[PDB]
Amino acid sequence: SGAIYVGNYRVVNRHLATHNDWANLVWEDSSRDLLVSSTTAQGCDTIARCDCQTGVYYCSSRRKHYPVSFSKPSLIFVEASEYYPARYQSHLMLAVGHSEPGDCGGILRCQHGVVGIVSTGGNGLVGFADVRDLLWLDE
Ligand SMILES: NC(=O)[C@H]1CCCN(C(=O)[C@H](OCC2CCCC2)c2ccccc2)C1
Ligand SMILES: [Zn+2]
């Protein structure tokens, strides 16, 4: 679990969004595994606006942060689940690292701020849903 709080927005994994998230829906993209809902309290997370390929992510299944090198956002294949059919997830970045179910929502950060959130795992890889292109989160 985990979320990003920026301005009057809350960014979460779409497959973990709550009834309150869907009742205050601003935007969702199943192909990205992202959902953004509105909040009343102001958020103070800073979103990174960059092309970094190195950063640090929080891994809840190890209670630890790990430094990683990660790929540029791209269309990558993902298998089925209580949540999705086998499909290509867009705007996804992979790194070599530990990720298991429960780790979704962990934040990946670079020196510029929040880059994305854990969205996929397995086979010794971790995949992050990028949020750096969502320029509207800042206004
Ligand atoms: N964005 C998606 O479509 C994801 C939805 C949840 C599921 N998912 C995954 O990639 C992994 O879960 C299934 C594996 C298969 C073998 C053991 C569990 C996973 C998720 C999070 C962290 C680590 C691993 C795909
Ligand atoms: Zn950066």
Look up 104 and say whether it is catalytic. Answer: yes
Give just the sign of the alpha carbon dihedral 65, 131, 82, 25. Answer: positive
Instruction: Say yes or no: 32 and 99 in one domain.
Output: no
Residues 60, 14 share a domain: no
Indicate whether 53 and 109 sit together in one domain: yes
- The answer on 119 and 51 residing in a single domain is yes
What's the resolution in A?
Answer: 1.4
Domain count, the chain: 2
Q: Give residue for tokens 């299944």.
A: 61
Within 10 Å of residue 13's Cβ, how many Cβ atoms?
22
Question: Is residue 100 located within the same domain as residue 90?
Answer: yes
97 lines ligand 1 (CB under 6 A): no
Of the candidates 115, 101, 133, 119, which has an alpha carbon nearest to the alpha carbon of residue 69? Answer: 115
Verify that 97 and 111 share a domain, yes or no. Answer: yes
Method used for this model?
Answer: X-ray
Same domain, 50 and 63: yes
Bridge partner residues of 47 (DSSP): 114
Q: Is the same domain home to 84 and 108?
A: yes
Burial 87-96 (b: 16+ CB within 10 A, else e): eebbbbbbbe
59: annotated binding-site residue? Answer: no
**Same domain flag for 65 and 31:** no
Question: Ligand 1: which of 78, 91, 92, 103 to mutate, most ligand atoms within 8 Å of CB?
Answer: 78
Report whether residue 92 contacts ligand 1, using a CB cutoff of 6 Å.
no
Ligand nearest to the CA of 118: 1
Residue 36: give the domain boundaries.
3-44
